[PDB]
Amino acid sequence: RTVARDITLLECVGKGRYGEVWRGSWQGENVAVKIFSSRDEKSWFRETELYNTVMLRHENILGFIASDMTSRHSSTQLWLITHYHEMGSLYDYLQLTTLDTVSCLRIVLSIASGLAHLHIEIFGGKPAIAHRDLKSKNILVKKNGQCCIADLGLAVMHRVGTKRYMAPEVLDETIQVDCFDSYKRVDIWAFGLVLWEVARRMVSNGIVEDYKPPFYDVVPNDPSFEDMRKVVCVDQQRPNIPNRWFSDPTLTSLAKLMKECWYQNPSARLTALRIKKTLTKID
């Protein structure tokens, strides 16, 4: 039989130290192609090993298509091929777009749904999975208004995370590394920061905050590990909740939720399943 393999790379939609992401075409259909730098080969191996263990299929997880390794003269080429989401990342989307109550809740409940799917072991099924690098650049926006979680290069089944989004126990090196639940609680911290990023862009009484990343007012760009440790661990700062949120029932409820993702004590933080339940009871 014929195995029509070739993907046409059409345009570069992201370039970094990780490598590059391209919009590509296969059999007349868009795919996303992540081409790994030599620097980040282990992310390709980890995500490939995970998908070789469990073929995740969930509306709020970026859809896997293929992992490809191709021999070159003097190098190995590593590609990850996934579904393509033309609206791009949540980070991208929040820069210019404002939200209403329905679109804000649909975004954050979709992320909570993807995260709970990763976290919960299913028997017969899937291992429990922690993401370890959850942030708004690792979430894509779909045309139907839901999001999906991307990049399982650091995922653990039962490179370090982005420093801006690191939980206090990672920064002060107290994390219980032998306890899988520790990794879930690190993702919940990061989820709370994403929930804050999104909620700022929800309009209430004609007011909205500009897009800012978590801790924009207390750390530099490309904050150091020490910069973050002083803010999060030593001074125990948390992102600001604007007064205008307390006039809006949705943002009042979202502020309570994000506070319950940011407890210093990791075992006090909400679970992804409890976050989903709380979000279904808002509005």
Ligand X SMILES: COc1cc(-c2cncc(-c3ccc(C4CCN(C)CC4)cc3)c2C)cc(OC)c1OC
The residue among 219, 245, 247, 220 whose CA lies nearest residue 232 is 219
Considering only residues 3 to 22 of the shown chain, the ones binding its own copies according to CB under 8 A are 3-9
Residue placing its CB nearer to its own copies in the complex, 41 or 209: 41
Smallest gap from residue 121 Cβ to its own copies (A): 18
Q: Is 5 in the site for ligand X (CB under 6 A)?
A: yes
**Nearer to its own copies among residue 71 and residue 144 (C-beta):** 71
Closest CB to its own copies among residues 44, 183: 44
Residue 55 contact among its own copies, ligand X, none, beta carbon within 5 to 8 Å by kind: its own copies
**Residue from 13, 14, 20, 45 in contact with its own copies (CB under 8 A):** 45
- Token pair, residue 229, equals 């440790």
Residue whose tokens read 């509306």: 59
Residue 14: strand, helix, or coil: strand
- Which residues are catalytically annotated? 133
In 120-271, alpha helices (H): 168-171, 180-199, 225-229, 249-259
Instruction: Consult the annotation and say whether 125 binds a ligand.
Output: no
Residue 15 counted as an annotated binding residue: yes
d(CA 191, CA 197): 10
Beta-strand pair 19-26/29-36: antiparallel
Which residues between 29 and 88 bind ligand X (CB under 6 A)?
32-34, 62, 65-66, 68, 70-72, 75, 77, 79-80, 82, 84-86, 88
27 binding its own copies? (CB under 8 A): no
Chain centroid to Cα 168, Å, comes to 18
Q: 72-88 burial by CB neighbour count: b if 16+ within 10 A, else e?
A: eeeeeebbbbbbbbeee
Q: Does residue 52 bind its own copies (CB under 8 A)?
A: yes
Candidates 60, 89, 250, 253; binder of ligand X (CB under 6 A) is 89
Under a CB-based contact definition with an 8 Å cutoff, are residues 143 and 166 in contact? no
Name the closest residue to ligand X (Cβ): 88
Structure-block tokens of residue 271? 């679970």
Q: Which class for 143: exposed (0-12), middle (13-18), buried (19 or more C-beta within 10 A)?
A: exposed
Enter the tokens of residue 21. Answer: 């992401």
Could you give the string, one character per residue 90-109, with x where binding to ligand X holds by CB under 6 A and - elsewhere?
Answer: --x-----------------
Binding site for ligand X (CB under 6 A): 3-5, 7, 13-14, 21, 26, 32-34, 62, 65-66, 68, 70-72, 75, 77, 79-80, 82, 84-86, 88-89, 92, 138, 140, 150-151
